[PDB]
């Protein structure tokens, strides 16, 4: 099964472009990233920054998540993003989206495991 981290890259990362190049960006990207495979995902954001810069947000500003959890982080700087929002005519399998370009701070939930001892090697 696809990992949680890979699924985030698939749904949100587009470091290959600096911004949405046209009004059909979302229609194309929601389809090519499989976000319209079985249903039309309603709202989705793509981030036009390097994978290193997006992963770095996990060590930036800790803020509360929408659901009340405490593992969300907000980027210190704004980032180039594209908001994809379904239009009213959107009807699976013919999903349809409005593309909006923005420069905003992103807020993402991060997961990992702390760097801790896992084996005892020797003493000296």
């Amino acid at each position: 099964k696809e990992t949680a981290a890979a699924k985030f890259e698939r749904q949100h990362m587009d470091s290959s472009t600096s911004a949405a190049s046209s009004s059909n960006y979302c229609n194309q990207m929601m389809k090519s990233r499989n976000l319209t495979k079985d249903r039309c995902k309603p709202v989705n954001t793509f981030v036009h920054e390097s994978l290193a810069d997006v992963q770095a947000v996990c060590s930036q500003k800790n803020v509360a998540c929408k659901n009340g959890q405490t593992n969300c982080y907000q980027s210190y700087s704004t980032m180039s993003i594209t908001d994809c929002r379904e239009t009213g005519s959107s009807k699976y399998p013919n999903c349809a989206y409005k593309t909006t370009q923005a420069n905003k701070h992103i807020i993402v939930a991060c997961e990992g495991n702390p760097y801790v001892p896992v084996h005892f090697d020797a003493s000296v």
Side-chain angles (χ1 to χ4, degrees), residues 70-107:
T70 65
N71 63 321
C72 279
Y73 289 80
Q74 181 176 310
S75 57
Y76 288 136
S77 304
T78 59
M79 294 188 162
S80 171
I81 62 178
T82 297
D83 289 315
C84 292
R85 290 196 277 106
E86 254 192 315
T87 65
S89 300
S90 188
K91 173 197 295 253
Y92 182 83
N94 300 299
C95 299
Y97 298 84
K98 170 189 299 182
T99 294
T100 300
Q101 182 55 42
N103 286 93
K104 297 187 159 161
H105 307 268
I106 62 161
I107 300 165

PDB file of all heavy atoms in Angstrom, residues 70-107:
ATOM      1  N   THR A  70      -2.312  18.183  17.450  1.00  0.00           N
ATOM      2  CA  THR A  70      -1.250  19.164  17.647  1.00  0.00           C
ATOM      3  C   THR A  70      -0.021  19.012  16.764  1.00  0.00           C
ATOM      4  O   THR A  70       1.010  19.638  17.025  1.00  0.00           O
ATOM      5  CB  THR A  70      -0.794  19.126  19.168  1.00  0.00           C
ATOM      6  OG1 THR A  70      -0.193  17.855  19.461  1.00  0.00           O
ATOM      7  CG2 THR A  70      -2.015  19.253  20.077  1.00  0.00           C
ATOM      8  N   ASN A  71      -0.122  18.190  15.723  1.00  0.00           N
ATOM      9  CA  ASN A  71       1.033  17.948  14.877  1.00  0.00           C
ATOM     10  C   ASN A  71       0.980  18.685  13.549  1.00  0.00           C
ATOM     11  O   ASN A  71       1.484  18.171  12.547  1.00  0.00           O
ATOM     12  CB  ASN A  71       1.198  16.437  14.606  1.00  0.00           C
ATOM     13  CG  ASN A  71      -0.003  15.842  13.830  1.00  0.00           C
ATOM     14  OD1 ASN A  71      -1.146  16.213  14.075  1.00  0.00           O
ATOM     15  ND2 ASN A  71       0.257  14.914  12.893  1.00  0.00           N
ATOM     16  N   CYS A  72       0.364  19.859  13.528  1.00  0.00           N
ATOM     17  CA  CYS A  72       0.360  20.634  12.261  1.00  0.00           C
ATOM     18  C   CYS A  72       1.462  21.704  12.347  1.00  0.00           C
ATOM     19  O   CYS A  72       1.818  22.209  13.430  1.00  0.00           O
ATOM     20  CB  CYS A  72      -1.013  21.292  12.006  1.00  0.00           C
ATOM     21  SG  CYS A  72      -2.149  20.052  11.302  1.00  0.00           S
ATOM     22  N   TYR A  73       2.036  22.021  11.186  1.00  0.00           N
ATOM     23  CA  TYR A  73       3.089  22.991  11.082  1.00  0.00           C
ATOM     24  C   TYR A  73       2.773  23.945   9.977  1.00  0.00           C
ATOM     25  O   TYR A  73       2.239  23.557   8.948  1.00  0.00           O
ATOM     26  CB  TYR A  73       4.436  22.297  10.800  1.00  0.00           C
ATOM     27  CG  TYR A  73       4.867  21.573  12.033  1.00  0.00           C
ATOM     28  CD1 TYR A  73       4.321  20.325  12.352  1.00  0.00           C
ATOM     29  CD2 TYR A  73       5.766  22.197  12.929  1.00  0.00           C
ATOM     30  CE1 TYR A  73       4.652  19.698  13.568  1.00  0.00           C
ATOM     31  CE2 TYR A  73       6.112  21.567  14.168  1.00  0.00           C
ATOM     32  CZ  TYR A  73       5.528  20.325  14.455  1.00  0.00           C
ATOM     33  OH  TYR A  73       5.726  19.710  15.675  1.00  0.00           O
ATOM     34  N   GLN A  74       3.117  25.201  10.209  1.00  0.00           N
ATOM     35  CA  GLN A  74       2.858  26.263   9.249  1.00  0.00           C
ATOM     36  C   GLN A  74       4.177  26.798   8.718  1.00  0.00           C
ATOM     37  O   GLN A  74       5.133  27.017   9.476  1.00  0.00           O
ATOM     38  CB  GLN A  74       2.038  27.363   9.949  1.00  0.00           C
ATOM     39  CG  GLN A  74       1.658  28.554   9.056  1.00  0.00           C
ATOM     40  CD  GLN A  74       0.756  29.553   9.797  1.00  0.00           C
ATOM     41  OE1 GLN A  74      -0.255  29.181  10.404  1.00  0.00           O
ATOM     42  NE2 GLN A  74       1.145  30.830   9.766  1.00  0.00           N
ATOM     43  N   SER A  75       4.261  27.019   7.404  1.00  0.00           N
ATOM     44  CA  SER A  75       5.512  27.485   6.838  1.00  0.00           C
ATOM     45  C   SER A  75       5.823  28.928   7.287  1.00  0.00           C
ATOM     46  O   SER A  75       4.913  29.763   7.399  1.00  0.00           O
ATOM     47  CB  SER A  75       5.527  27.435   5.306  1.00  0.00           C
ATOM     48  OG  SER A  75       4.464  28.182   4.741  1.00  0.00           O
ATOM     49  N   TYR A  76       7.088  29.192   7.555  1.00  0.00           N
ATOM     50  CA  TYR A  76       7.482  30.565   7.977  1.00  0.00           C
ATOM     51  C   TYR A  76       7.273  31.543   6.825  1.00  0.00           C
ATOM     52  O   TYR A  76       6.777  32.652   7.056  1.00  0.00           O
ATOM     53  CB  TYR A  76       8.954  30.584   8.365  1.00  0.00           C
ATOM     54  CG  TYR A  76       9.258  29.878   9.671  1.00  0.00           C
ATOM     55  CD1 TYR A  76      10.366  29.024   9.780  1.00  0.00           C
ATOM     56  CD2 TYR A  76       8.477  30.123  10.810  1.00  0.00           C
ATOM     57  CE1 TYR A  76      10.691  28.416  11.031  1.00  0.00           C
ATOM     58  CE2 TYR A  76       8.798  29.534  12.044  1.00  0.00           C
ATOM     59  CZ  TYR A  76       9.885  28.698  12.131  1.00  0.00           C
ATOM     60  OH  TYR A  76      10.146  28.079  13.350  1.00  0.00           O
ATOM     61  N   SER A  77       7.609  31.127   5.593  1.00  0.00           N
ATOM     62  CA  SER A  77       7.464  31.972   4.403  1.00  0.00           C
ATOM     63  C   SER A  77       6.258  31.535   3.602  1.00  0.00           C
ATOM     64  O   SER A  77       5.773  30.407   3.763  1.00  0.00           O
ATOM     65  CB  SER A  77       8.673  31.841   3.441  1.00  0.00           C
ATOM     66  OG  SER A  77       9.932  32.107   4.029  1.00  0.00           O
ATOM     67  N   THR A  78       5.780  32.411   2.741  1.00  0.00           N
ATOM     68  CA  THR A  78       4.705  32.032   1.838  1.00  0.00           C
ATOM     69  C   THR A  78       5.347  31.115   0.785  1.00  0.00           C
ATOM     70  O   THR A  78       6.559  31.113   0.549  1.00  0.00           O
ATOM     71  CB  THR A  78       4.083  33.213   1.090  1.00  0.00           C
ATOM     72  OG1 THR A  78       5.115  33.869   0.315  1.00  0.00           O
ATOM     73  CG2 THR A  78       3.420  34.154   2.062  1.00  0.00           C
ATOM     74  N   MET A  79       4.488  30.322   0.143  1.00  0.00           N
ATOM     75  CA  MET A  79       4.861  29.393  -0.906  1.00  0.00           C
ATOM     76  C   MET A  79       3.841  29.550  -2.037  1.00  0.00           C
ATOM     77  O   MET A  79       2.697  29.914  -1.807  1.00  0.00           O
ATOM     78  CB  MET A  79       4.789  27.948  -0.364  1.00  0.00           C
ATOM     79  CG  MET A  79       5.838  27.687   0.715  1.00  0.00           C
ATOM     80  SD  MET A  79       5.780  25.889   1.067  1.00  0.00           S
ATOM     81  CE  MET A  79       7.367  25.677   1.901  1.00  0.00           C
ATOM     82  N   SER A  80       4.309  29.282  -3.240  1.00  0.00           N
ATOM     83  CA  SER A  80       3.474  29.338  -4.426  1.00  0.00           C
ATOM     84  C   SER A  80       2.575  28.089  -4.370  1.00  0.00           C
ATOM     85  O   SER A  80       3.082  26.937  -4.289  1.00  0.00           O
ATOM     86  CB  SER A  80       4.372  29.224  -5.666  1.00  0.00           C
ATOM     87  OG  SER A  80       3.535  29.066  -6.826  1.00  0.00           O
ATOM     88  N   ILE A  81       1.271  28.300  -4.402  1.00  0.00           N
ATOM     89  CA  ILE A  81       0.328  27.171  -4.352  1.00  0.00           C
ATOM     90  C   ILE A  81      -0.791  27.338  -5.349  1.00  0.00           C
ATOM     91  O   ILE A  81      -1.021  28.408  -5.897  1.00  0.00           O
ATOM     92  CB  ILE A  81      -0.319  27.024  -2.956  1.00  0.00           C
ATOM     93  CG1 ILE A  81      -1.156  28.285  -2.602  1.00  0.00           C
ATOM     94  CG2 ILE A  81       0.845  26.795  -1.934  1.00  0.00           C
ATOM     95  CD1 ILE A  81      -1.874  28.181  -1.251  1.00  0.00           C
ATOM     96  N   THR A  82      -1.488  26.237  -5.636  1.00  0.00           N
ATOM     97  CA  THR A  82      -2.659  26.340  -6.502  1.00  0.00           C
ATOM     98  C   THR A  82      -3.808  25.674  -5.751  1.00  0.00           C
ATOM     99  O   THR A  82      -3.620  24.574  -5.291  1.00  0.00           O
ATOM    100  CB  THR A  82      -2.461  25.593  -7.827  1.00  0.00           C
ATOM    101  OG1 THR A  82      -1.359  26.210  -8.540  1.00  0.00           O
ATOM    102  CG2 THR A  82      -3.767  25.703  -8.706  1.00  0.00           C
ATOM    103  N   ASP A  83      -4.913  26.404  -5.531  1.00  0.00           N
ATOM    104  CA  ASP A  83      -6.129  25.838  -4.926  1.00  0.00           C
ATOM    105  C   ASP A  83      -6.989  25.256  -6.016  1.00  0.00           C
ATOM    106  O   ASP A  83      -7.216  25.932  -7.028  1.00  0.00           O
ATOM    107  CB  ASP A  83      -6.948  26.954  -4.276  1.00  0.00           C
ATOM    108  CG  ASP A  83      -6.287  27.491  -3.042  1.00  0.00           C
ATOM    109  OD1 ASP A  83      -5.818  26.663  -2.229  1.00  0.00           O
ATOM    110  OD2 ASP A  83      -6.229  28.726  -2.884  1.00  0.00           O
ATOM    111  N   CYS A  84      -7.411  24.003  -5.884  1.00  0.00           N
ATOM    112  CA  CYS A  84      -8.294  23.399  -6.874  1.00  0.00           C
ATOM    113  C   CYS A  84      -9.618  23.179  -6.171  1.00  0.00           C
ATOM    114  O   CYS A  84      -9.642  22.504  -5.166  1.00  0.00           O
ATOM    115  CB  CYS A  84      -7.762  22.026  -7.288  1.00  0.00           C
ATOM    116  SG  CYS A  84      -6.197  22.161  -8.230  1.00  0.00           S
ATOM    117  N   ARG A  85     -10.732  23.717  -6.701  1.00  0.00           N
ATOM    118  CA  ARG A  85     -12.029  23.599  -6.019  1.00  0.00           C
ATOM    119  C   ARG A  85     -13.027  23.135  -7.068  1.00  0.00           C
ATOM    120  O   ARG A  85     -13.107  23.706  -8.156  1.00  0.00           O
ATOM    121  CB  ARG A  85     -12.478  24.995  -5.502  1.00  0.00           C
ATOM    122  CG  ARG A  85     -11.708  25.591  -4.352  1.00  0.00           C
ATOM    123  CD  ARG A  85     -12.562  26.747  -3.761  1.00  0.00           C
ATOM    124  NE  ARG A  85     -12.421  28.020  -4.479  1.00  0.00           N
ATOM    125  CZ  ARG A  85     -13.302  28.610  -5.309  1.00  0.00           C
ATOM    126  NH1 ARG A  85     -14.513  28.092  -5.624  1.00  0.00           N
ATOM    127  NH2 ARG A  85     -12.953  29.786  -5.831  1.00  0.00           N
ATOM    128  N   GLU A  86     -13.828  22.118  -6.749  1.00  0.00           N
ATOM    129  CA  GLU A  86     -14.802  21.658  -7.711  1.00  0.00           C
ATOM    130  C   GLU A  86     -15.779  22.729  -8.145  1.00  0.00           C
ATOM    131  O   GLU A  86     -16.179  23.600  -7.358  1.00  0.00           O
ATOM    132  CB  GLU A  86     -15.645  20.569  -7.046  1.00  0.00           C
ATOM    133  CG  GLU A  86     -15.391  19.217  -7.470  1.00  0.00           C
ATOM    134  CD  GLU A  86     -16.507  18.274  -6.950  1.00  0.00           C
ATOM    135  OE1 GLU A  86     -16.847  18.434  -5.735  1.00  0.00           O
ATOM    136  OE2 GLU A  86     -17.010  17.455  -7.758  1.00  0.00           O
ATOM    137  N   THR A  87     -16.185  22.678  -9.408  1.00  0.00           N
ATOM    138  CA  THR A  87     -17.202  23.638  -9.857  1.00  0.00           C
ATOM    139  C   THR A  87     -18.557  22.995  -9.607  1.00  0.00           C
ATOM    140  O   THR A  87     -18.678  21.793  -9.319  1.00  0.00           O
ATOM    141  CB  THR A  87     -17.140  23.903 -11.361  1.00  0.00           C
ATOM    142  OG1 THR A  87     -17.478  22.699 -12.071  1.00  0.00           O
ATOM    143  CG2 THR A  87     -15.772  24.316 -11.761  1.00  0.00           C
ATOM    144  N   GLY A  88     -19.614  23.785  -9.805  1.00  0.00           N
ATOM    145  CA  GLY A  88     -20.948  23.216  -9.627  1.00  0.00           C
ATOM    146  C   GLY A  88     -21.397  22.192 -10.660  1.00  0.00           C
ATOM    147  O   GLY A  88     -22.324  21.396 -10.395  1.00  0.00           O
ATOM    148  N   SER A  89     -20.721  22.184 -11.814  1.00  0.00           N
ATOM    149  CA  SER A  89     -21.046  21.262 -12.896  1.00  0.00           C
ATOM    150  C   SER A  89     -20.295  19.953 -12.798  1.00  0.00           C
ATOM    151  O   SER A  89     -20.545  19.006 -13.566  1.00  0.00           O
ATOM    152  CB  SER A  89     -20.719  21.906 -14.255  1.00  0.00           C
ATOM    153  OG  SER A  89     -21.461  23.098 -14.431  1.00  0.00           O
ATOM    154  N   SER A  90     -19.368  19.907 -11.858  1.00  0.00           N
ATOM    155  CA  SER A  90     -18.561  18.712 -11.654  1.00  0.00           C
ATOM    156  C   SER A  90     -19.443  17.471 -11.331  1.00  0.00           C
ATOM    157  O   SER A  90     -20.207  17.500 -10.351  1.00  0.00           O
ATOM    158  CB  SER A  90     -17.611  18.973 -10.516  1.00  0.00           C
ATOM    159  OG  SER A  90     -16.724  17.839 -10.474  1.00  0.00           O
ATOM    160  N   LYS A  91     -19.338  16.407 -12.128  1.00  0.00           N
ATOM    161  CA  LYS A  91     -20.151  15.204 -11.875  1.00  0.00           C
ATOM    162  C   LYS A  91     -19.419  13.971 -12.322  1.00  0.00           C
ATOM    163  O   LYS A  91     -19.262  13.745 -13.529  1.00  0.00           O
ATOM    164  CB  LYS A  91     -21.494  15.349 -12.597  1.00  0.00           C
ATOM    165  CG  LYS A  91     -22.376  14.055 -12.552  1.00  0.00           C
ATOM    166  CD  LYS A  91     -23.472  14.177 -13.658  1.00  0.00           C
ATOM    167  CE  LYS A  91     -24.426  15.324 -13.369  1.00  0.00           C
ATOM    168  NZ  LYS A  91     -25.804  14.870 -12.915  1.00  0.00           N
ATOM    169  N   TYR A  92     -18.933  13.205 -11.332  1.00  0.00           N
ATOM    170  CA  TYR A  92     -18.169  11.979 -11.601  1.00  0.00           C
ATOM    171  C   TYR A  92     -18.874  11.180 -12.708  1.00  0.00           C
ATOM    172  O   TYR A  92     -20.085  10.982 -12.619  1.00  0.00           O
ATOM    173  CB  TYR A  92     -18.049  11.135 -10.317  1.00  0.00           C
ATOM    174  CG  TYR A  92     -17.230   9.889 -10.530  1.00  0.00           C
ATOM    175  CD1 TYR A  92     -15.843   9.924 -10.479  1.00  0.00           C
ATOM    176  CD2 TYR A  92     -17.849   8.684 -10.865  1.00  0.00           C
ATOM    177  CE1 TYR A  92     -15.083   8.783 -10.760  1.00  0.00           C
ATOM    178  CE2 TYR A  92     -17.095   7.552 -11.152  1.00  0.00           C
ATOM    179  CZ  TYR A  92     -15.716   7.599 -11.096  1.00  0.00           C
ATOM    180  OH  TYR A  92     -14.960   6.463 -11.322  1.00  0.00           O
ATOM    181  N   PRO A  93     -18.118  10.628 -13.686  1.00  0.00           N
ATOM    182  CA  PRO A  93     -16.667  10.661 -13.859  1.00  0.00           C
ATOM    183  C   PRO A  93     -16.116  11.945 -14.498  1.00  0.00           C
ATOM    184  O   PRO A  93     -14.900  12.066 -14.594  1.00  0.00           O
ATOM    185  CB  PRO A  93     -16.407   9.464 -14.755  1.00  0.00           C
ATOM    186  CG  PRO A  93     -17.526   9.580 -15.730  1.00  0.00           C
ATOM    187  CD  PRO A  93     -18.743   9.862 -14.798  1.00  0.00           C
ATOM    188  N   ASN A  94     -16.993  12.875 -14.853  1.00  0.00           N
ATOM    189  CA  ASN A  94     -16.560  14.141 -15.492  1.00  0.00           C
ATOM    190  C   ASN A  94     -16.378  15.217 -14.442  1.00  0.00           C
ATOM    191  O   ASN A  94     -17.182  16.139 -14.289  1.00  0.00           O
ATOM    192  CB  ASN A  94     -17.588  14.578 -16.535  1.00  0.00           C
ATOM    193  CG  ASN A  94     -17.743  13.546 -17.607  1.00  0.00           C
ATOM    194  OD1 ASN A  94     -16.779  13.231 -18.319  1.00  0.00           O
ATOM    195  ND2 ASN A  94     -18.914  12.957 -17.690  1.00  0.00           N
ATOM    196  N   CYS A  95     -15.301  15.063 -13.682  1.00  0.00           N
ATOM    197  CA  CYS A  95     -15.003  16.013 -12.605  1.00  0.00           C
ATOM    198  C   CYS A  95     -14.527  17.310 -13.201  1.00  0.00           C
ATOM    199  O   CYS A  95     -13.992  17.300 -14.296  1.00  0.00           O
ATOM    200  CB  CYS A  95     -13.939  15.417 -11.710  1.00  0.00           C
ATOM    201  SG  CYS A  95     -14.492  13.841 -10.942  1.00  0.00           S
ATOM    202  N   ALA A  96     -14.731  18.432 -12.509  1.00  0.00           N
ATOM    203  CA  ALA A  96     -14.343  19.721 -13.087  1.00  0.00           C
ATOM    204  C   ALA A  96     -13.983  20.664 -11.944  1.00  0.00           C
ATOM    205  O   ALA A  96     -14.653  20.690 -10.907  1.00  0.00           O
ATOM    206  CB  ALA A  96     -15.500  20.302 -13.860  1.00  0.00           C
ATOM    207  N   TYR A  97     -12.951  21.456 -12.158  1.00  0.00           N
ATOM    208  CA  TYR A  97     -12.408  22.329 -11.119  1.00  0.00           C
ATOM    209  C   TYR A  97     -12.038  23.725 -11.562  1.00  0.00           C
ATOM    210  O   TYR A  97     -11.687  23.934 -12.724  1.00  0.00           O
ATOM    211  CB  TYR A  97     -11.059  21.701 -10.612  1.00  0.00           C
ATOM    212  CG  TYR A  97     -11.187  20.360  -9.985  1.00  0.00           C
ATOM    213  CD1 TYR A  97     -11.208  19.205 -10.751  1.00  0.00           C
ATOM    214  CD2 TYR A  97     -11.419  20.258  -8.586  1.00  0.00           C
ATOM    215  CE1 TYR A  97     -11.468  17.948 -10.174  1.00  0.00           C
ATOM    216  CE2 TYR A  97     -11.672  19.011  -7.986  1.00  0.00           C
ATOM    217  CZ  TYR A  97     -11.702  17.884  -8.770  1.00  0.00           C
ATOM    218  OH  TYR A  97     -11.980  16.657  -8.178  1.00  0.00           O
ATOM    219  N   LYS A  98     -12.130  24.642 -10.609  1.00  0.00           N
ATOM    220  CA  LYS A  98     -11.663  26.001 -10.789  1.00  0.00           C
ATOM    221  C   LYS A  98     -10.231  26.020 -10.235  1.00  0.00           C
ATOM    222  O   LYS A  98      -9.956  25.486  -9.154  1.00  0.00           O
ATOM    223  CB  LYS A  98     -12.527  26.959 -10.025  1.00  0.00           C
ATOM    224  CG  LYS A  98     -11.935  28.371  -9.990  1.00  0.00           C
ATOM    225  CD  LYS A  98     -12.716  29.252  -9.030  1.00  0.00           C
ATOM    226  CE  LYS A  98     -14.186  29.366  -9.481  1.00  0.00           C
ATOM    227  NZ  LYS A  98     -15.016  30.257  -8.602  1.00  0.00           N
ATOM    228  N   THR A  99      -9.327  26.664 -10.991  1.00  0.00           N
ATOM    229  CA  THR A  99      -7.907  26.807 -10.636  1.00  0.00           C
ATOM    230  C   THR A  99      -7.668  28.213 -10.130  1.00  0.00           C
ATOM    231  O   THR A  99      -8.066  29.175 -10.799  1.00  0.00           O
ATOM    232  CB  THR A  99      -7.032  26.607 -11.892  1.00  0.00           C
ATOM    233  OG1 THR A  99      -7.155  25.242 -12.329  1.00  0.00           O
ATOM    234  CG2 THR A  99      -5.562  26.879 -11.629  1.00  0.00           C
ATOM    235  N   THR A 100      -7.034  28.334  -8.949  1.00  0.00           N
ATOM    236  CA  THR A 100      -6.722  29.643  -8.389  1.00  0.00           C
ATOM    237  C   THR A 100      -5.288  29.611  -7.881  1.00  0.00           C
ATOM    238  O   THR A 100      -4.939  28.768  -7.046  1.00  0.00           O
ATOM    239  CB  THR A 100      -7.649  30.010  -7.189  1.00  0.00           C
ATOM    240  OG1 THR A 100      -9.010  30.027  -7.635  1.00  0.00           O
ATOM    241  CG2 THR A 100      -7.298  31.421  -6.659  1.00  0.00           C
ATOM    242  N   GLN A 101      -4.462  30.545  -8.357  1.00  0.00           N
ATOM    243  CA  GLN A 101      -3.039  30.597  -7.930  1.00  0.00           C
ATOM    244  C   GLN A 101      -2.911  31.516  -6.739  1.00  0.00           C
ATOM    245  O   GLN A 101      -3.630  32.502  -6.638  1.00  0.00           O
ATOM    246  CB  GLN A 101      -2.204  31.084  -9.138  1.00  0.00           C
ATOM    247  CG  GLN A 101      -0.677  31.173  -8.960  1.00  0.00           C
ATOM    248  CD  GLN A 101       0.027  29.881  -8.483  1.00  0.00           C
ATOM    249  OE1 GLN A 101      -0.291  28.734  -8.950  1.00  0.00           O
ATOM    250  NE2 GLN A 101       1.035  30.079  -7.544  1.00  0.00           N
ATOM    251  N   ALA A 102      -2.029  31.175  -5.793  1.00  0.00           N
ATOM    252  CA  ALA A 102      -1.875  31.994  -4.580  1.00  0.00           C
ATOM    253  C   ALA A 102      -0.465  31.873  -4.042  1.00  0.00           C
ATOM    254  O   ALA A 102       0.282  31.040  -4.487  1.00  0.00           O
ATOM    255  CB  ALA A 102      -2.854  31.545  -3.500  1.00  0.00           C
ATOM    256  N   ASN A 103      -0.092  32.794  -3.143  1.00  0.00           N
ATOM    257  CA  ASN A 103       1.203  32.726  -2.462  1.00  0.00           C
ATOM    258  C   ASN A 103       0.802  32.862  -1.020  1.00  0.00           C
ATOM    259  O   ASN A 103       0.424  33.958  -0.549  1.00  0.00           O
ATOM    260  CB  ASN A 103       2.136  33.862  -2.867  1.00  0.00           C
ATOM    261  CG  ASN A 103       2.681  33.661  -4.239  1.00  0.00           C
ATOM    262  OD1 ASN A 103       2.115  34.146  -5.225  1.00  0.00           O
ATOM    263  ND2 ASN A 103       3.737  32.903  -4.338  1.00  0.00           N
ATOM    264  N   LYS A 104       0.834  31.753  -0.305  1.00  0.00           N
ATOM    265  CA  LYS A 104       0.388  31.733   1.083  1.00  0.00           C
ATOM    266  C   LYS A 104       1.234  30.809   1.931  1.00  0.00           C
ATOM    267  O   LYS A 104       1.963  29.966   1.418  1.00  0.00           O
ATOM    268  CB  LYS A 104      -1.043  31.205   1.146  1.00  0.00           C
ATOM    269  CG  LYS A 104      -2.045  32.103   0.398  1.00  0.00           C
ATOM    270  CD  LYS A 104      -3.458  31.694   0.589  1.00  0.00           C
ATOM    271  CE  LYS A 104      -4.331  32.916   0.273  1.00  0.00           C
ATOM    272  NZ  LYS A 104      -5.766  32.592  -0.036  1.00  0.00           N
ATOM    273  N   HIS A 105       1.119  30.947   3.240  1.00  0.00           N
ATOM    274  CA  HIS A 105       1.824  29.988   4.112  1.00  0.00           C
ATOM    275  C   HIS A 105       0.988  28.699   4.096  1.00  0.00           C
ATOM    276  O   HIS A 105      -0.244  28.740   4.092  1.00  0.00           O
ATOM    277  CB  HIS A 105       1.878  30.498   5.545  1.00  0.00           C
ATOM    278  CG  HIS A 105       2.430  31.877   5.642  1.00  0.00           C
ATOM    279  ND1 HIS A 105       3.768  32.128   5.841  1.00  0.00           N
ATOM    280  CD2 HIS A 105       1.820  33.084   5.523  1.00  0.00           C
ATOM    281  CE1 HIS A 105       3.968  33.440   5.847  1.00  0.00           C
ATOM    282  NE2 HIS A 105       2.810  34.035   5.656  1.00  0.00           N
ATOM    283  N   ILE A 106       1.657  27.545   4.062  1.00  0.00           N
ATOM    284  CA  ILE A 106       0.919  26.281   4.082  1.00  0.00           C
ATOM    285  C   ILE A 106       0.904  25.689   5.462  1.00  0.00           C
ATOM    286  O   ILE A 106       1.824  25.977   6.270  1.00  0.00           O
ATOM    287  CB  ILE A 106       1.498  25.249   3.063  1.00  0.00           C
ATOM    288  CG1 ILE A 106       2.959  24.863   3.374  1.00  0.00           C
ATOM    289  CG2 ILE A 106       1.359  25.861   1.620  1.00  0.00           C
ATOM    290  CD1 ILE A 106       3.360  23.527   2.683  1.00  0.00           C
ATOM    291  N   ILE A 107      -0.141  24.888   5.748  1.00  0.00           N
ATOM    292  CA  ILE A 107      -0.258  24.232   7.049  1.00  0.00           C
ATOM    293  C   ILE A 107      -0.445  22.776   6.775  1.00  0.00           C
ATOM    294  O   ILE A 107      -1.369  22.405   6.113  1.00  0.00           O
ATOM    295  CB  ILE A 107      -1.442  24.751   7.863  1.00  0.00           C
ATOM    296  CG1 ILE A 107      -1.250  26.259   8.106  1.00  0.00           C
ATOM    297  CG2 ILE A 107      -1.559  23.940   9.170  1.00  0.00           C
ATOM    298  CD1 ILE A 107      -2.569  26.907   8.581  1.00  0.00           C
TER     299      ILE A 107
END
